Structure formats: structure tokens, C-alpha cells
Amino acid sequence: PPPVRDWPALDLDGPEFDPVLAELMREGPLTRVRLPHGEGWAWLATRYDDVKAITNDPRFGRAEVTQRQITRLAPHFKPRPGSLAFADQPDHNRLRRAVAGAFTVGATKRLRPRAQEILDGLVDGILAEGPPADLVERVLEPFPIAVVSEVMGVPAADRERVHSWTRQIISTSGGAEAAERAKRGLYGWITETVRARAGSEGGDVYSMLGAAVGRGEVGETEAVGLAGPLQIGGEAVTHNVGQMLYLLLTRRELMARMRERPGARGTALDELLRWISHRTSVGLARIALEDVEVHGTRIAAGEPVYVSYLAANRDPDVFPDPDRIDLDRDPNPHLAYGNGHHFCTGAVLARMQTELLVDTLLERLPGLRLAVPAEQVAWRRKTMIRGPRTLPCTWHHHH
Amino acid sequence: PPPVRDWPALDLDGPEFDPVLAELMREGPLTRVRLPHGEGWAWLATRYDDVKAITNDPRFGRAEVTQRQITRLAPHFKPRPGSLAFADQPDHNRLRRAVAGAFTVGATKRLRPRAQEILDGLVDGILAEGPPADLVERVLEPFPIAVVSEVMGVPAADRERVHSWTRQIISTSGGAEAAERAKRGLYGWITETVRARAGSEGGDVYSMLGAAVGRGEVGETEAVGLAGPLQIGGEAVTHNVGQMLYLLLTRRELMARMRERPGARGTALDELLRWISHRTSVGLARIALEDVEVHGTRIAAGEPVYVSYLAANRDPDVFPDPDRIDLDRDPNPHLAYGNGHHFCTGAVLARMQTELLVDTLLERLPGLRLAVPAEQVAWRRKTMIRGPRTLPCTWHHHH
Ligand code: HEM
Ligand code: HEM
Ligand SMILES: Oc1cc(O)c2c(O)cc(O)c(O)c2c1
Numbered sequence: 001p002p003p004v005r006d007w008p009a010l011d012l013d014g015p016e017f018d019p020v021l022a023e024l025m026r027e028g029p030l031t032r033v034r035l036p037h038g039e040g041w042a043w044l045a046t047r048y049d050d051v052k053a054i055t056n057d058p059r060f061g062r063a064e065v066t067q068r069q070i071t072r073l074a075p076h077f078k079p080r081p082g083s084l085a086f087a088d089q090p091d092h093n094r095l096r097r098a099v100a101g102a103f104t105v106g107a108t109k110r111l112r113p114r115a116q117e118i119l120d121g122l123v124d125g126i127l128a129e130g131p132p133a134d135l136v137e138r139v140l141e142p143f144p145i146a147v148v149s150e151v152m153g154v155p156a157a158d159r160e161r162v163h164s165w166t167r168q169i170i171s172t173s174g175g176a177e178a179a180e181r182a183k184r185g186l187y188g189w190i191t192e193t194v195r196a197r198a199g200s201e202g203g204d205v206y207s208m209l210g211a212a213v214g215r216g217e218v219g220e221t222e223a224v225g226l227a228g229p230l231q232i233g234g235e236a237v238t239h240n241v242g243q244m245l246y247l248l249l250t251r252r253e254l255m256a257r258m259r260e261r262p263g264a265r266g267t268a269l270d271e272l273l274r275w276i277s278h279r280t281s282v283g284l285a286r287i288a289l290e291d292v293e294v295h296g297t298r299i300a301a302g303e304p305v306y307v308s309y310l311a312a313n314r315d316p317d318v319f320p321d322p323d324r325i326d327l328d329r330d331p332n333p334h335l336a337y338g339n340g341h342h343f344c345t346g347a348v349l350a351r352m353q354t355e356l357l358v359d360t361l362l363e364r365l366p367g368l369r370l371a372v373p374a375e376q377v378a379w380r381r382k383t384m385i386r387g388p389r390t391l392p393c394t395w396h397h398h399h
Numbered sequence: 400p401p402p403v404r405d406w407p408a409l410d411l412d413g414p415e416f417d418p419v420l421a422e423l424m425r426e427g428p429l430t431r432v433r434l435p436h437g438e439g440w441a442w443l444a445t446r447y448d449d450v451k452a453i454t455n456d457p458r459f460g461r462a463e464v465t466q467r468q469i470t471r472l473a474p475h476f477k478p479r480p481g482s483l484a485f486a487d488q489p490d491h492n493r494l495r496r497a498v499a500g501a502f503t504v505g506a507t508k509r510l511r512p513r514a515q516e517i518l519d520g521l522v523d524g525i526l527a528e529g530p531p532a533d534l535v536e537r538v539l540e541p542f543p544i545a546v547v548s549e550v551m552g553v554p555a556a557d558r559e560r561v562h563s564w565t566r567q568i569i570s571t572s573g574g575a576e577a578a579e580r581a582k583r584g585l586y587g588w589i590t591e592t593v594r595a596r597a598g599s600e601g602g603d604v605y606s607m608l609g610a611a612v613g614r615g616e617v618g619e620t621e622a623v624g625l626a627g628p629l630q631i632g633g634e635a636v637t638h639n640v641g642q643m644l645y646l647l648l649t650r651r652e653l654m655a656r657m658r659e660r661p662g663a664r665g666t667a668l669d670e671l672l673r674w675i676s677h678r679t680s681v682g683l684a685r686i687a688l689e690d691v692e693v694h695g696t697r698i699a700a701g702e703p704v705y706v707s708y709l710a711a712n713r714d715p716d717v718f719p720d721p722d723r724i725d726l727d728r729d730p731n732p733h734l735a736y737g738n739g740h741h742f743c744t745g746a747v748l749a750r751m752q753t754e755l756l757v758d759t760l761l762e763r764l765p766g767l768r769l770a771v772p773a774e775q776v777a778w779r780r781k782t783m784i785r786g787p788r789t790l791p792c793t794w795h796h797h798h
């Protein structure tokens with residue numbers, strides 16, 4: 001049994017891969033780690049095959065972590081009822097039916113036109129005002145909030161409120177209770193809205209979920225836990241796309257490539273998803289229910305195991321020159337959105353948003369580039385999801 | 400003619416009546432003043448009868464002011480086309496018809512129910528969080544803007560954007576170049592919104608304006624000047640009511656009076672409007688069109704003339720014991736909203752908003768009191784409209 005490994009929190013002002021995670025990947029296909037909080041240590045799969053396996057083997061459960069105190073990254077751990085993250089079959093499957101409808105390819109394709117309009121409105125704004133604009137605050141943050149509020153079914157009279165609440169994405173940590181405050185309201189709002197819509201025939205989430213509730217498909221107690229994440233999910237697109245524009249803005253070569261292929265940015269966008277370190281460490285562990293051996297390691301039942309999709313995505317035996325950014329990279333089977341039934345509920349929704357963002361920004365902000373040195377862009381700290389806090393930009397205007 | 404009097408802008412942290420305006424009021428009915436900017440001096444009428452007459456006489460025009468550089472309180476003066484303020488018959492009339500229908504008594508009543516729910520939501524918020532709350536930022540600031548964006552007809556997904564921009568009201572000012580930024584965005588949005596809605600039946604201001612534009616009744620170029628003031632006109636409510644409450648929170652007698660007369664606060668709200676010095680100095684002057692003589696004084700054609708509704712409102716001959724906040728006051732024909740064709744377009748809307756705030760706040764926040772000593776409440780400086788910048792309050796919460 002390899003020694004336990006201390007794994008601190010990252011303090012790097014950039015997209016660089018975690019130096020301490022680089023270590024463990026070299027230590028062996030399975031390691032034991034001690035995160036900033038919680039008690040004890042946990043296993044960590046680092047290899048692609050191992051990662052893809054664990055994540056899809058019924059032998060490991062998520063439900064059992066709620067009932068414990070496995071070492072984690074977050075200081076606090078209070079799992080809500082109904083969260084897809086900690087639901088196992090047949091529960092994970094049940095809860096999913098009350099919301100997955102509005103997250104399908106077809107529902108995303110149906111949503112695309114409206115989304116493009118919202119994005120274009122935010123773009124008109126920065127364009128009317130003139131050249132110096134913080135893209136994060138003016139486009140990356142609000143755009144995802146707005147599109148998702150469409151998917152969720154947020155009523156008109158409450159667009160501003162839910163927008164403002166959700167805008168508790170924080171500048172980084174601009175408030176401990178100041179964020180609990182926003183969640184407090186939002187969650188009171190959601191529980192109510194689900195009560196209303198007891199049995200409405202709506203394709204939007206807040207109706208489907210409502211109906212399912214008033215029909216015992218998913219009675220209350222599971223509302224917030226099921227809808228909270230989705231309603232707040234947009235923030236994930238804000239950071240990730242934030243990282244992509246940063247790379248584009250500081251690596252002129254990539255920007256070039258991206259501008260040269262309108263209509264064929266697919267592989268480039270997938271190469272960015274693979275390379276970028278979306279999370280700071282590892283989260284959402286799994287519990288080894290009935291004693292198992294992983295890649296030659298013995299994992300006794302009851303012991304927690306973390307998987308690193310970031311590490312997996314740099315698997316030498318799966319992605320040659322894994323550290324190099326390709327953009328044209330062949331099939332590219334990255335695990336950015338996870339693997340299994342816990343696969344990202346918003347994978348497709350998030351991908352369509354990323355596309356509009358990259359396409360609209362390159363089309364409508366010519367001469368786009370950092371308004372200040374890269375070194376001046378601060379990065380989020382003490383957060384699960386990595387990303388730039390701002391992205392000051394300039395672009396051509398008038399002589 | 401009387402000597403030219405220098406009337407500086409003043410820094411008064413409280414609702415006190417402008418002292419220099421007090422000196423000017425006893426110096427006689429028609430004095431001459433020199434405001435901080437512009438060129439030369441201007442006539443100033445202080446008597447009720449003179450103020451009402453001058454304000455209703457066709458021999459005084461507003462348009463001509465747009466061509467001159469009359470002494471003024473504002474550092475820069477750049478009148479926009481389509482402005483009711485500076486439009487004379489028939490333009491003023493033509494402009495008003497295109498938007499006035501949304502500010503009628505009947506329209507306000509129809510709006511009332513919805514305004515109440517908006518206010519109740521904001522109040523739910525502070526009640527949920529607990530006592531310490533700055534009434535200005537949490538209620539008086541957002542309430543007016545929200546109701547006015549309903550009256551104006553802002554989408555919903557755009558509301559959050561309009562408000563953010565509209566906040567070019569800030570606190571005294573957060574920046575000049577920044578203010579001319581927020582409106583660069585807001586006025587671009589207004590222009591575009593109006594262009595769309597070319598053919599619209601809508602009751603909205605934007606919609607009605609767009610139909611008038613398309614019909615060439617008040618075509619483009621005039622849109623921003625006409626709608627701009629209305630879209631941002633809500634702050635007038637934010638600051639006037641801020642003064643009302645400040646008086647209630649610092650003068651027990653007043654508070655007890657208002658709390659003991661629910662359903663009959665009518666004369667008390669009017670007395671506040673009369674007493675409260677809503678703006679600093681005087682603002683929109685008129686040009687003498689055909690040489691006139693007022694209250695004995697001869698004003699040569701071409702000379703500018705300012706009137707003071709605040710001074711008119713303290714006329715001993717019309718309001719015995721003028722400086723005493725009486726309430727219960729008989730007719731009380733105060734001119735807080737001006738008089739004549741330029742009468743406040745939003746008089747009724749503002750009044751309805753004021754009735755809801757006072758009523759809802761007194762009812763929903765039992766024991767409402769300042770959380771800090773009065774002297775800690777800071778006041779707006781270098782600003783046309785007067786008012787408290789914040790109102791930290793507390794109220795009965797728990798055992
Ligand atoms: C491109 C940005 C995004 C990335 C990279 C991403 C990535 C991921 C990953 C890796 C997981 C699985 C974690 C695990 O099980 O260990 C996940 C789960 C999830 N994501 Fe995302 N996500 C993104 C955007 C979103 C958005 C916009 C939403 C909401 C509309 C969302 C909702 C969810 C939910 C609800 C889960 C839990 C699924 C379950 O376990 O049943 N994600 N995401
Ligand atoms: C209780 C708060 C308010 C007070 C005390 C007030 C007072 C006044 C006064 C005294 C005038 C005349 C200025 C002059 O000619 O010297 C005026 C004009 C005007 N006000 Fe207000 N107002 C208030 C709220 C509002 C609101 C909320 C709006 C927007 C819906 C608004 C829109 C206007 C417009 C457009 C004019 C110019 C009218 C014209 O010349 O045709 N006001 N107001
Ligand atoms: O709706 C929530 C979302 C979260 O991310 C939460 C969290 O991270 C920690 C908690 O203690 C919570 O209670 C959380 C609640």
C-alpha cells in the first residue's frame with residue numbers, strides 16, 4: 001500500500017496542469033491521497049482505462065459517500081436529497097426522467113436560435129459601449145445564466161431575480177453567507193415554483209419537475225436537490241469557455257487556427273476540452289461496495305476511490321504527446337464530461353453554448369485580444385472549478 | 400434691476416431647505432442669479448403666483464434654451480432631439496401623445512397590482528435575511544426601476560441589462576466616462592428596440608413609440624430624447640421617498656402620525672412632497688419670447704428665467720407657517736410636480752409608487768427604525784436630485 005499523499009489546493013494564475021497531480025500520475029496507476037478536508041485518505045485512479053472502468057462499474061456506489069466523511073476538497077459536505085450526483089439506480093434513473101427531456105440534442109437544437117439572440121444582445125451591448133470590456137462579466141457569466149433560465153423554465157416576472165440570485169457565482173469568494181443568502185432565496189423560490197405547476201404539461205424543467213412531484217414521481221424533498229445544480233450549472237460553461245478564450249488570447253497560434261476554420265471548429269473545441277483542467281483537484285468519490293482489485297491494486301470494500309478525468313485526458317497511451325495542444329487531433333475520446341450514467345446532464349447544452357460563444361465572439365469582435373498583459377488576469381482560488389476571474393479585452397473600433 | 404447673486408451648488412447632509420434660496424426669497428419676488436456653470440446670470444421667480452403664471456404663459460419658451468448657454472447647475476448641457484422638457488407646442492404636444500398613455504391614472508391603476516408583487520418580493524428578501532438592511536439599496540433603488548421598465552415595456556431577459564445600465568444614477572457618480580458608457584449601451588438598446596416594434600399595437604412606451612416612429616409621427620432621432628428621461632425617471636422616486644422615510648425615521652411625531660392613519664395617508668404624503676427639497680438649485684429655465692413684466696419687474700425678451708417650485712411651495716401667502724411639516728393640510732396646492740404642459744409626465748406613476756412603499760414598508764417591517772445614528776446617513780453631493788445615499792434600518796425580528 002503506497003504512502004498517503006498530501007494534495008494541497010492550487011495557487012497558479014493560469015491554465016497550467018496541476019504539478020502535484022502530474023506527480024501521482026507518475027507514481028503509479030493507483031495512489032492514496034489526503035485532500036484539504038474531511039477525514040482519512042482515499043484511492044485515486046489516474047489511468048484512462050482504470051478511470052473509464054471504475055466510473056462505469058456497478059460495484060462502486062455514490063450513494064454511500066453521502067453517509068460518510070471521505071477526504072475531500074471542500075470544507076463542507078452537505079448532500080441534498082434528489083441530487084443526480086449521489087443517486088444510484090434505479091433512483092439515478094428515476095430522478096433523471098423528470099428533467100432530461102429539456103437537455104436533449106433535439107431540445108438543444110430547438111433552443112439554439114433563442115440562445116443566439118441573447119448572446120447577440122450582450123454583444124450589441126459591448127459593441128455600442130466601445131473596446132475596453134471584461135468578457136467574463138459581460139458575456140461569459142450572463143449568457144449561460146440566461147440560456148439556462150430558458151431551459152429551466154424561469155417565468156418572466158422572475159428573470160431578474162433568478163439571474164441575480166444565480167449570479168452568486170461569486171467573484172471568487174465575495175461572501176460566505178453572501179452566497180448562502182442567494183442560495184437561500186433561489187432555493188425557496190425553486191421549492192415554491194415546483195409546488196406550483198403541480199400537474200402542468202410543460203416541456204421546461206420547472207414544469208416537468210412540478211408535474212412529477214405532484215404525481216409522486218419525485219415528491220418534494222428532491223426538488224432543490226434535483227434542480228439546484230441544473231439551475232446553477234451555467235457557471236461551468238462560463239469558466240471552461242473562459243479558459244478557452246484565455247488560451248486563444250495568450251497563444252496567438254491557436255487563435256489563428258480557430259479563425260481560419262469557421263464551420264470546422266469541432267475538433268479544435270474538443271481538443272480544448274481535453275487539455276484544459278476544468279476542476280482544481282478531484283471530487284465526487286465512489287465507494288467500493290464489494291472488495292475489488294484495480295489494475296493490480298487491492299481496494300477493500302468500503303474504501304473511497306477518486307478518479308481524475310483531467311489526468312485520464314492526458315493518458316500517454318491514449319493521447320500521444322498528451323501535453324501538446326493539437327486542435328486537429330483525430331478521434332479525441334476525452335472524458336471532460338465524465339463517463340457513465342453520471343455523465344453530464346448538460347454536456348450537449350454546454351457544447352452548443354460554447355459553439356455560439358466562440359463563433360459569435362470571433363465573428364463580432366475583430367482584432368480581439370487582451371486589453372492588459374496575461375499576468376494581470378487573476379484566476380479563481382479556493383474553488384472547485386478553475387477559470388480566469390476577468391478577461392479584459394479590446395478590439396477594433398473607429399479611426 | 401437687482402444685483403446678480405451667486406447661487407453655488409451646496410453640500411447639505413440632511414433634508415434642510417437651501418439657505419441661499421431662503422435669502423433670495425426674502426430679497427424680493429424677482430431676483431437674478433449666477434449658477435455654477437454656463438454664461439451670465441438668470442432671472443428667478445420665487446412667489447407661488449409668479450411661478451405658476453410664468454410656467455403657464457406662452458410668452459416663455461423652452462426650445463430657445465437649447466440654442467443658448469444660460470447659466471446652469473449642470474457642468475455640461477447637451478439637449479437631445481425629442482425631449483419633452485425642451486419642446487414647445489406643437490412639438491411638445493406631438494411628442495407627449497406618443498408615450499403619455501402609459502402614464503395615465505387608468506394605466507397606473509392597472510399597473511398597481513403588479514407593482515405591489517414586485518415590492519413584496521423585494522421586501523420578502525430583506526425579511527428573510529434579517530433586520531440589518533440598507534433600505535435605499537435593497538428597496539428604493541430597485542423598486543422604481545423595475546416598475547418603470549414594466550411601464551416602458553422592456554422584454555424580461557433584457558430587464559437585468561436595462562437596470563444594470565440605468566444604474567448610471569449610481570451613488571453621487573461612480574465615474575463620468577463610465578456614465579457616458581452605460582447610456583451608450585442603454586441608448587443604443589432603446590434605438591434598436593424602437594426600430595423593432597415599427598408595427599406594434601402594444602400599450603408599452605417602447606411599442607407605442609415604435610408605432611409612432613414607423614408612422615412618422617415622431618420618427619427616429621427623437622426616440623432617445625423622448626424615452627431616455629422616462630426609462631431613467633424612476634430615480635426621482637428613489638430619492639424623494641428616501642427623504643420621506645428619512646424624515647419618518649428621524650422625527651417620531653411624523654412616524655406616529657403616519658402609522659396611526661392607514662388608508663388615510665393622502666394629505667400626509669402631499670405635505671411631504673411640499674416640504675421636501677427634491678432637487679438642488681433650479682433646473683429648466685425658459686426664455687422670455689416677447690418682453691414681459693412680472694410682479695413689477697420687467698424682463699427683457701431673450702433673457703432667461705428660472706422658477707423655483709421648492710420656494711413656491713414655501714410661500715407664506717399660500718402655505719401659512721410654511722416651514723412646519725403639518726400634514727392634515729387643507730387643499731395644499733403644492734407644485735412639486737411643476738405645472739402647465741411640462742407638468743411631470745410621471746406624476747401619477749411616482750405617486751402610486753410612493754403610496755405602495757410607505758404602506759408596504761410600514762406594514763411589513765414592524766418597528767422600522769434607523770440601525771445607525773442619523774448623522775451616519777450620508778447624502779448625495781454634486782447631484783441634481785437630493786436624497787440620502789443609504790438608509791440602514793432595523794425592525795422587529797426575534798426572541
Ligand atoms: C462545458 C462545461 C461543463 C463541463 C466540463 C462539465 C463536466 C461535468 C463532469 C465531468 C461531470 C461528472 C462528474 C462526476 O460524476 O465525477 C458533470 C456532471 C454534471 N453536470 Fe456538468 N459540465 C459542464 C456543464 C454543465 C451545465 C451547463 C450543467 C447544467 C445545465 C451541468 C450539469 C451537470 C449535472 C446535473 C451533473 C451531475 C450528473 C449526474 O451525476 O447524474 N453541467 N459535469
Ligand atoms: C416623486 C418623484 C418625482 C418628482 C418630485 C418629479 C418632479 C418633476 C418636476 C418638478 C418636473 C418639471 C420640471 C420643470 O419643468 O421645471 C418634472 C418633469 C418631468 N418628470 Fe418628473 N418627478 C418625479 C418622478 C418622475 C418619474 C418617475 C418620471 C418617469 C416615469 C418622471 C418624468 C418626468 C418627465 C418626462 C418630465 C418632463 C415633462 C415635460 O416637460 O413634458 N418624473 N418632474
Ligand atoms: O445547493 C448547494 C450547493 C452546493 O455546492 C453546496 C456545497 O457545496 C456545500 C454545502 O454545504 C451545501 O449545502 C451546498 C448546497
Ligand SMILES: Oc1cc(O)c2c(O)cc(O)c(O)c2c1
Pocket residue numbers: 085229236279282283284344
Ligand atoms: O453538480 C455538479 C456538476 C458538475 O459539472 C460537477 C463537476 O463537473 C465535477 C464535480 O466534482 C462535481 O461534483 C460536479 C457537480
Ligand SMILES: Oc1cc(O)c2c(O)cc(O)c(O)c2c1
Pocket residue numbers: 473475476477478479582627631
Ligand atoms: O440623462 C441625460 C442623458 C444625456 O445623454 C444627456 C446629455 O447628453 C446632455 C445633457 O445636458 C444631459 O443633461 C443629459 C442627461
Ligand SMILES: Oc1cc(O)c2c(O)cc(O)c(O)c2c1
Pocket residue numbers: 484628632635677678681682683
Ligand atoms: O426632466 C426632468 C425630470 C424630473 O423628474 C425632474 C425632477 O424631478 C425635478 C426637477 O427639478 C427637474 O427639473 C426634473 C426634470
